[PDB]
Write a protein that binds this ligand. Structure first.
Ligand code: CLA
Ligand code: CLA
Ligand code: CLA
Ligand code: CLA
Ligand SMILES: CC(C)=CCC/C(C)=C/CC/C(C)=C/CC/C(C)=C/CC/C(C)=C/CC/C(C)=C/CC/C(C)=C/CC/C(C)=C/CC/C(C)=C/CC1=CC(=O)C(C)=C(C)C1=O
Ligand SMILES: CCCCCCCCCCCCCCCCCC(=O)OC[C@H](CO[C@@H]1O[C@H](CO)[C@H](O)[C@H](O)[C@H]1O)OC(=O)CCCCCCCCCCCCCCCCC
Ligand SMILES: CCCCCCCCCCCCCCCCCC(=O)OC[C@H](CO[C@@H]1O[C@H](CO)[C@H](O)[C@H](O)[C@H]1O)OC(=O)CCCCCCCCCCCCCCCCC
Ligand SMILES: CCCCCCCCCCCCCCCCCC(=O)OC[C@H](CO[C@@H]1O[C@H](CO)[C@H](O)[C@H](O)[C@H]1O)OC(=O)CCCCCCCCCCCCCCCCC
Ligand SMILES: CCCCCCCCCCCCCCCCCC(=O)OC[C@H](CO[C@@H]1O[C@H](CO)[C@H](O)[C@H](O)[C@H]1O)OC(=O)CCCCCCCCCCCCCCCCC
Ligand SMILES: CCCCCCCCCCCCCCCC(=O)OC[C@H](COP(=O)(O)OC[C@@H](O)CO)OC(=O)CCCCCCCCCCCCCCC
Ligand SMILES: CC1=C(/C=C/C(C)=C/C=C/C(C)=C/C=C/C=C(C)/C=C/C=C(C)/C=C/C2=C(C)CCCC2(C)C)C(C)(C)CCC1
Ligand code: OEX
Ligand SMILES: [Fe+2]
Lengths: 42, 51, 334, 51, 52, 153, 245, 30, 35, 93, 38, 52, 42
């Protein structure tokens, strides 16, 4: 018998902070593509 | 009294439809025992769709 | 022009993504077979008779384990030191019962790590480097071959070898304490000093470089962007960090030479782990650590206890309980 | 249809009786007539993928 | 006396395997010329492909 | 019943674990009643007190000690060469108060069951089916507050 | 045989020969003497079968599926002694000493591992007639001891004659009037003795060499780990060999 | 049901090791 | 089981022979100094 | 067994069992270990102290030390897990 | 590698279409939760 | 049969033809470049840079 | 008695698609701050 609140602990302990760190990378590459002025800035 | 369609097996009746009855555990869906199923058993198909 | 010369030119090319080399000809087939068998034996592998008493110890995830308790179990006491491949097992079910995949993983591991070590030499030859990174990697190769190879040899069985897991590691360390008294042995003492010293001089060198960095950034951007890659200017005032540590302890204890400084970082751990891995090796052949039990007596002759006698009663608790069914005779000769 | 199903170079289709008691993987020879379009005839499956 | 011989000649036989590693790393590189270090004028890595 | 409820090792905050979760009622269940205070007497008639478990020990051997410290009875691990078993000494249990108020059990199967639960402080009747109580002790909010606010600090 | 006795020890070891019973040559009759005592009876089974619920076409009657042995070459009995007493109607045998147990473990379809002690302890054989013949056929009951002697410690540390008697890392189970009586069966370790019925059949005799040998069939019951599970009926077959003296 | 989470954590860890080796930000001089 | 065994000695002495005849292939001369 | 009666008659009550005691239990009787104690432990179930004289291969001296301690010897119900480990139960000083 | 792809574009999502897509998910989460918990 | 004292673990005769065709199949590759060279050409170096 | 796989259905049915739609907005505002060239482009 395992604790059924541990699935919510682990799978949100993975996904919520890991999806956070993806966002800081995507907006980093968007600012670099934003300044660069070619074909992707818009 | 407990076939594979009672146990909610979904893709497993599609392996046994085209000719897979044995497994590496030694059991079979036809009930006859087997010494060696070789490569193409239930575990061999599942592991080869992964590779 | 020939087919072999066009193959030697590719296999020794530094223009590959990963350098393969001639050691990679027997690094990559060995370590991919140690890997691909480890992932299967850690996830899906039936229980294993380790004590040879036909009491199978579960070690995989499908048989109710986790990351901590799950482990590739060592081979049987019934096999012992005998070579047990798949073709000398008459079925795979007989192979997996008696501790099959422990020998397949370990023997393809020690060949692949001793080939990963020679591969670090080879690329240093083809790049113009001075060669001896692979001598620093000899220290974990000495320690990997001590607990997987040398200790099963001197104890005469792979069942005393180290279980490939996390809880199996601490089953290995505690049983090794009761039977060999490693903490009193001066070679575990010389490598605790190797990694306490190693983590000291790591964080002591890494702080004095980061302390004395030169202004190249603003306070908004990161500290690390003041280093452009491949630049030829020195990125920290080494005279500054020498004058700091020259006052923090005293003047003459400080390396002004950065080459002799960066050599002492490679000396201290590696010598500490060479010596330690020859502690497991000399304790594989039952040359145990110190034994100061009943060493202090009064003039009457009664035993006065010491801290080693309290340490002995912790060793007696593990000795009378390890492999609680495997023994039949009063002395653990194995 | 020529090799996997008809059992020339294959196991064949899971067939069964009319009432789901007996069933086994066996080669199925094709039925070419109008009986091939009886969909409960397993020979029509072999005759389809060959034709 | 078995445990003194199996723990001392075994002890040395690893360090002489380290002597095969030191003295052949130097001797293979002393034959090739770069045992004293990398030349600043001619670095071999700079005359290679892009890194990937 | 409240005063004897503090005399119970499951209410000690130094018995729980870290990664076990939930209230202390998840430990063994909601308490119902006080079973009473067992008093152990041998065939000689002297009073034997069960040695109590300290907070360190998860497991502790059941030991019955008289008034001066002499080991008089126990429950032996090794049953072969047994010299202080309950069968030899003939320890009878007497309850006083609680719902077992005047009762006396004399045979070795029943006395061993109450000698094991008497090293855990007082003796209670619990209800372990309401919260699916597994059977290991948790910690009080005294224990958790000391955990956070000292790892924070 | 005497052909096995020709070899030295270094030629037999590692070859799997010491596991295998001898092959007796020829057929004739031999008469047991008054003080006749059986000397080198070895029994080795060549096939195993466990009674299970088999998956036929529509029915689930109990049948024997076979199994693969997983303990390697440790199944043969050896050196079994005993006097051959002559009752008037039927010649009898009662074994006395020798290695008369060989623990082994077979695996079923599905991955289930069934250990069983294979034994001939306290065997009372009875066969038709007096002299050993190629048509002779004796058998009888033997007592199977338990697979584990009572001082075996399970993973929690509980045995029949030693160890604890409660769930040692579950200290809140013995709380209340009921105690831990819900898991009572896994605390009480009961030594179990069952019965087994072997049926031997002599078919090839030497009288100039006084050694017999033929085919047997033995059925017994597998182990239960002192009441942990329901034991299962195990059938086996093989060949034996004996020196009648 | 419980071991399915452990397997997903392990092979999910080996994914980001794969992407870090082969899709690494390749450092360049100038 | 004697069919697998044949397959291993192929694979071992394939790569062992690539190792043995790799360093016999004028391997000291493959340096960034000259040739 | 959780609740086994006659734990005392095994080794420590100074009134020994016959068909359940270890051979170490007869060490406390001077004269019987190892010869006379070796025959008692080796043979099968006994029903009384009178069955000790039925042992095949007894002398008058072997019956003598049994005659001394026949008040201390007594026979109980053979529970078959104790009857196996009568030569050696894995207890060593 | 090969050259840079001339089919690189950029993805946009204004503040308006954020609140549509958030409210779309929460209302589908309100609606379908009661059936999933059963 | 594990503990038999047989050369290289060659139990059956068929395993020899595996060994001989493994060393020779790469030997013949190796002789395609380093074979059929002059076996009488020396150097007073520590290391030879002769040819391919 | 409820199904304990429904907590994983709902709380990942909320968070995983809703954290997706946040990312498309953050990189949208980063491209607009990327082209704009003042104090935030970098
Ligand atoms: C190429 C790298 C490599 C290496 C070194 C090994 C090595 C090994 N494997 Mg492995 N294996 C590999 C790749 C490799 N494997 C691959 C790619 C696979 C996937 C197919 C496997 C699959 C595999 C399985 C499934 C098993 C092994 C096993 C083994 C072990 C014994 C096999 C054996 O009999 O070797 C054959 C070796 C020889 C015949 C010796 C060759 C050495 C030559 C002759 C050099 C010696 C020079 C000589 C002394 C010079 C003499 C000169 C004279 C004048 C005196 C061994 C540790 C077995 C094992 O570990 O079980 C415990 C096992 O069951 N392997
Ligand atoms: C303060 C406490 C303390 C400290 C600091 C140490 C320190 C040490 N102990 Mg020790 N010990 C202690 C208490 C302590 N001990 C106590 C209390 C006991 C009694 C229970 C012991 C019992 C004990 C034993 C029994 C052993 C040690 C050992 C060691 C050494 C471990 C170093 C090591 O193995 O790395 C060396 C590195 C390796 C072994 C790893 C090799 C890995 C290879 C190179 C590559 C693997 C790659 C991997 C698979 C994949 C890479 C990533 C991938 C994604 C690419 C070190 C000196 C070990 C020792 O003596 O050295 C062997 C040992 O066996 N100790
Ligand atoms: C030797 C000659 C031969 C034989 C015996 C067969 C045998 C068969 N063929 Mg085949 N076939 C052959 C030659 C042959 N084929 C050749 C030469 C071709 C040309 C390449 C085809 C093309 C063909 C197709 C395209 C189909 C068959 C099908 C069939 C099966 C018919 C029985 C059945 O289940 O259909 C059941 C009958 C139908 C499903 C009728 C299809 C009409 C559709 C469904 C109407 C609805 C369409 C609409 C979009 C649905 C939404 C509306 C909704 C409101 C209802 C049977 C296995 C059918 C099949 O595989 O089904 C299992 C099928 O669909 N055959
Ligand atoms: C100072 C902080 C603090 C303290 C002492 C407590 C104390 C308590 N809370 Mg509580 N709680 C807090 C903050 C706190 N809470 C906050 C901030 C929240 C909102 C999220 C909650 C929400 C909450 C709920 C919903 C419940 C409790 C409950 C409880 C009780 C039992 C908890 C238990 O067994 O721990 C369990 C032990 C742990 C969780 C281990 C501690 C953390 C370890 C050390 C890991 C640390 C994190 C790690 C480093 C990161 C891993 C990341 C990885 C997964 C990616 C206990 C009285 C329960 C109760 O009984 O209430 C009736 C209950 O139902 N609390
Ligand atoms: C008058 C009266 C009242 C009477 C009473 C008498 C009286 C007054 C008594 C009082 C006297 C009293 C006790 C005073 C004595 C003071 C005293 C010494 C007390 C302290 C006590 C004590 C135990 C001290 C000893 C401990 C001590 C400090 C040891 C030092 C350890 C030591 C030598 C370490 C050296 C390690 C080392 C080699 C480090 C360098 C390697 C390393 C990687 C460093 C990093 C690094 C180094 C560089 O160099 C540079 C360049 C860079 C880049 C860099 O990364
Ligand atoms: C973004 C990430 C979002 C996820 C956060 C991830 C955190 C994961 C760790 C917390 C969850 C683990 C709890 C176990 C899961 C479980 O089922 O528990 C479930 C338990 C609740 O327990 C349940 O309770 C119910 C009635 O309350 C019933 O009784 C159930 O039977 C019982 O299981 O929940 C908790 O214990 C949550 C506690 C969280 C608060 C932590 C308090 C301790 C904090 C101390 C801080 C110290 C930090 C110092 C710094 C280090
Ligand atoms: C011409 C076109 C021919 C059709 C395309 C080729 C057939 C592809 C169909 C899918 C493959 C069939 C399923 C896999 C069969 C399989 O399991 O094999 C396994 C079987 C033997 O498998 C054995 O089966 C036994 C009983 O099940 C046991 O399971 C044994 O373990 C297992 O080894 O082998 C064959 O069937 C292989 C033949 C399949 C075709 C080989 C590839 C053909 C490629 C030719 C095209 C290239 C040339 C074109 C010219 C350029
Ligand atoms: C210094 C460190 C210590 C060095 C090792 C010390 C030498 C150890 C002794 C080596 C024994 C060599 C005897 C021949 C091999 C042997 O019989 O093995 C043959 C053994 C026997 O193999 C088994 O034998 C059994 C018979 O009892 C059964 O028949 C089994 O089926 C059969 O597998 O198999 C192995 O050990 C295979 C080893 C595979 C390792 C090959 C890797 C080598 C690659 C190194 C690169 C080559 C360069 C070195 C060559 C120059
Ligand atoms: C990103 C989002 C990631 C989350 C995805 C969210 C999807 C949520 C909906 C699926 C989860 C709801 C399942 C109920 C939860 C539950 O516990 O079930 C749990 C059940 C499993 O059931 C458990 O099974 C166990 C052994 O298998 C035990 O028996 C348990 O008792 C039993 O509960 O899981 C499912 O049923 C999952 C099914 C998901 C597949 C859906 C199949 C139907 C799809 C049809 C597609 C039609 C679509 C047409 C377009 C419209
Ligand atoms: C396995 C991996 C799982 C993948 C899941 C990840 C994808 C999940 C989310 C994607 C869908 C997002 C929808 C975004 C929504 C979106 O951004 O809208 C904007 C979008 C188009 O907008 P434009 O073309 O203006 O877009 C301009 C661009 O700059 C931005 O899109 O509209 C639609 O596509 C149709 C309108 C749907 C809008 C929802 C209308 C319904 C309103 C809500 C009803 C609920 C209230 C009901 C009350 C009763
Ligand atoms: C919890 C739960 C569950 C489960 C679920 C699951 C299990 C899920 C999973 C899912 C998954 C797991 C999914 C996945 C998906 C993915 C995707 C969608 C991906 C994509 C990809 C991509 C994006 C790619 C990319 C690329 C690369 C990488 C390279 C090259 C280029 C390209 C582009 C191609 C269920 C319902 C049962 C029940 C209830 C609860
Ligand atoms: O196997 Mn693993 O641990 Ca080395 O000591 Mn002897 O053997 Mn067994 O006992 Mn203790
Ligand atoms: Fe540095």
């Amino acid at each position: 018998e395992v604790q059924f609140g541990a699935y919510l602990a682990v799978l949100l302990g993975t996904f919520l902070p890991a999806l956070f760190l993806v966002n800081l990378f995507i907006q980093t590459e968007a600012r670099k593509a934003g300044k660069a002025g070619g074909q992707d800035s818009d | 009294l407990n076939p594979m369609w009672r146990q909610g097996m979904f893709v497993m009746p599609f392996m046994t439809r085209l000719g897979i009855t044995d497994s590496w555990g030694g059991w079979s869906i036809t009930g006859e025992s087997v010494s060696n199923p070789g490569i193409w058993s239930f575990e061999g198909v599942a592991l080869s769709h992964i590779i | 022009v020939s087919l072999w010369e066009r193959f030697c030119a590719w296999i020794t090319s530094t223009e590959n993504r990963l350098y393969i080399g001639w050691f990679g000809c027997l690094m990559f087939p060995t370590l991919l077979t140690a890997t691909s068998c480890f992932i299967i034996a850690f996830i899906a592998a039936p229980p294993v008779d380790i004590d040879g008493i036909r009491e199978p110890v579960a070690g995989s995830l499908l048989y109710g384990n986790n990351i901590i308790s799950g482990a590739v179990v060592p081979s049987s006491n019934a096999i012992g030191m005998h070579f047990y491949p798949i073709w000398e097992a008459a079925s795979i079910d007989e192979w997996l019962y008696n501790g099959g995949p422990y020998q397949l993983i370990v023997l393809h591991f020690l060949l692949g790590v001793s080939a990963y070590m020679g591969r670090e030499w080879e690329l240093s030859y083809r790049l113009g480097m001075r060669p001896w990174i692979f001598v620093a990697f000899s220290a974990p190769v000495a320690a990997a071959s001590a607990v997987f190879l040398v200790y099963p040899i001197g104890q005469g069985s792979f069942s005393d070898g180290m279980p490939l897991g996390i809880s199996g590691t601490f089953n290995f360390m505690l049983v090794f304490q009761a039977e060999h008294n490693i903490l009193m042995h001066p070679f575990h003492m010389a490598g605790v000093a190797g990694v306490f010293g190693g983590s000291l001089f790591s964080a002591m060198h890494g702080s004095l470089v980061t302390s004395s960095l030169i202004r190249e950034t603003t306070e908004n951007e990161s500290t690390n962007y003041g280093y452009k890659f491949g630049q030829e200017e020195e990125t920290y005032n080494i005279v500054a960090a020498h004058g700091y540590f020259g006052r923090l302890i005293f003047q003459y204890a400080s390396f002004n030479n950065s080459r002799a400084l960066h050599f002492f970082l490679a000396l201290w751990p590696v010598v500490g782990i060479w010596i330690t891995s020859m502690g497991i090796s000399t304790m594989a052949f039952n040359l145990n650590g110190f034994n100061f039990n009943q060493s202090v007596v009064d003039s009457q002759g009664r035993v006065i206890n010491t801290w080693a006698d309290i340490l002995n009663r912790a060793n007696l608790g593990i000795e009378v309980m390890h492999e609680r069914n495997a023994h039949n005779f009063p002395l653990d000769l194995a | 249809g020529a090799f996997h199903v008809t059992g020339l170079f294959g196991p064949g289709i899971w067939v069964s009786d009319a009432y789901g008691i007996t069933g086994k993987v066996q080669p199925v020879a094709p039925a070419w007539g109008a009986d091939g379009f009886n969909p409960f005839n397993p020979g029509g499956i072999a005759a389809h993928h060959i034709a | 006396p078995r445990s003194w011989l199996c723990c001392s000649h075994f002890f040395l036989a690893f360090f002489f395997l380290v002597g095969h590693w030191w003295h052949s790393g130097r001797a293979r590189a002393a034959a090739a010329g770069f045992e004293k270090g990398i030349n600043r004028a001619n670095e071999p890595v700079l005359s290679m492909r892009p890194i990937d | 019943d409240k005063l004897a409820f503090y005399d119970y090792i499951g209410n000690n905050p130094a018995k729980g674990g870290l990664f076990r979760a939930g209230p202390m009622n998840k430990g063994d269940g909601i308490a119902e009643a006080w079973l009473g205070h067992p008093i152990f007497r041998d065939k000689e008639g002297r009073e034997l007190t069960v040695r109590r478990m300290p907070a360190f020990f998860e497991t502790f051997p059941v030991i019955l000690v008289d008034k001066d410290g002499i080991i008089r009875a126990d429950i032996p691990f090794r049953r072969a060469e047994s010299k202080y078993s309950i069968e030899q000494v003939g320890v009878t249990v007497d309850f006083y108060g609680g719902k077992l108020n005047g009762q006396t059990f004399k045979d070795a199967p029943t006395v061993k069951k109450f000698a094991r639960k008497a090293q855990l402080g007082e003796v209670f009747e619990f209800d372990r089916t309401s919260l699916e109580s597994d059977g290991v002790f948790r910690s009080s909010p005294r224990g958790w507050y000391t955990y956070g606010h000292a790892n924070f600090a | 045989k005497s052909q096995i006795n020709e070899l030295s020890y270094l030629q037999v070891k590692g070859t799997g020969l010491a596991n295998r019973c001898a092959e007796v040559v020829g057929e004739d009759s031999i008469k047991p003497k008054p003080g006749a005592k059986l000397v080198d009876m070895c029994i080795e089974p060549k096939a195993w079968a466990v009674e299970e619920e088999v998956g036929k076409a529509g029915k689930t009657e109990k049948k024997f599926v076979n199994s693969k042995v997983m303990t390697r070459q440790t199944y043969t009995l050896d050196a079994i002694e005993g006097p051959i007493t002559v009752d008037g109607g039927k010649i009898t045998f009662n074994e006395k000493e020798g290695i008369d147990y060989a623990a082994t473990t077979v695996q079923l379809p599905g991955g289930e591992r069934v250990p069983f002690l294979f034994t001939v302890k306290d065997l009372v054989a009875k066969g038709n007639g007096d002299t050993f013949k190629p048509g002779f056929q004796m058998g009888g009951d033997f007592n199977t001891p338990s697979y584990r002697t009572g001082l075996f410690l399970d993973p929690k540390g509980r045995g029949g004659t030693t160890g604890y008697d409660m769930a040692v890392a579950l200290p809140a189970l013995q709380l209340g009037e009921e105690g831990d009586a819900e898991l009572f069966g896994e605390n009480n370790k009961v030594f179990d003795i069952t019965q087994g019925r072997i049926e031997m059949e002599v078919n090839k005799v030497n009288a100039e060499d006084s050694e017999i040998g033929g085919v047997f069939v033995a059925t017994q019951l597998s182990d239960t780990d002192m009441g942990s599970k329901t034991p299962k009926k195990v059938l086996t077959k093989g060949i034996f060999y004996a020196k009648v003296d | 049901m419980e071991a399915l989470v452990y397997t997903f954590l392990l092979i999910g860890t080996l994914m980001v090791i794969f992407f870090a080796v082969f899709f690494r930000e390749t450092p360049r001089i100038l | 089981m004697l069919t697998l065994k044949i397959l291993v000695y192929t694979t071992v002495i394939f790569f062992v022979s690539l190792f043995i005849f790799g360093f016999l292939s004028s391997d000291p001369s493959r340096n960034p100094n000259r040739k | 067994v959780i609740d086994y009666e006659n734990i005392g008659y095994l080794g420590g009550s100074s009134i020994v069992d016959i068909n359940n005691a270890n051979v170490r239990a007869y060490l406390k009787m001077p004269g019987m270990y190892p010869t006379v104690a070796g025959k008692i432990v080796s043979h099968g179930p006994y029903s009384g102290v009178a069955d000790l004289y039925k042992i095949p291969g007894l002398s008058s001296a072997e019956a003598d030390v049994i005659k001394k301690y026949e008040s201390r010897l007594t026979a109980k119900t053979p529970s078959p897990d104790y009857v196996i480990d009568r030569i050696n139960n894995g207890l060593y000083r | 590698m090969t050259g840079p792809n001339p089919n690189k574009q950029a993805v946009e999502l204004n503040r308006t279409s954020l609140y549509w897509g958030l409210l779309l998910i929460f209302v589908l989460a309100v609606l379908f939760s009661s059936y999933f918990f059963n | 049969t594990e503990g038999t004292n047989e050369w290289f673990g060659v139990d059956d005769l068929r395993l020899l033809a595996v060994l001989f065709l493994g060393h020779w199949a790469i030997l013949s590759l190796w002789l395609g470049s380093y074979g059929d060279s002059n076996e009488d050409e020396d150097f007073f170096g520590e290391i030879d840079y002769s040819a391919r």
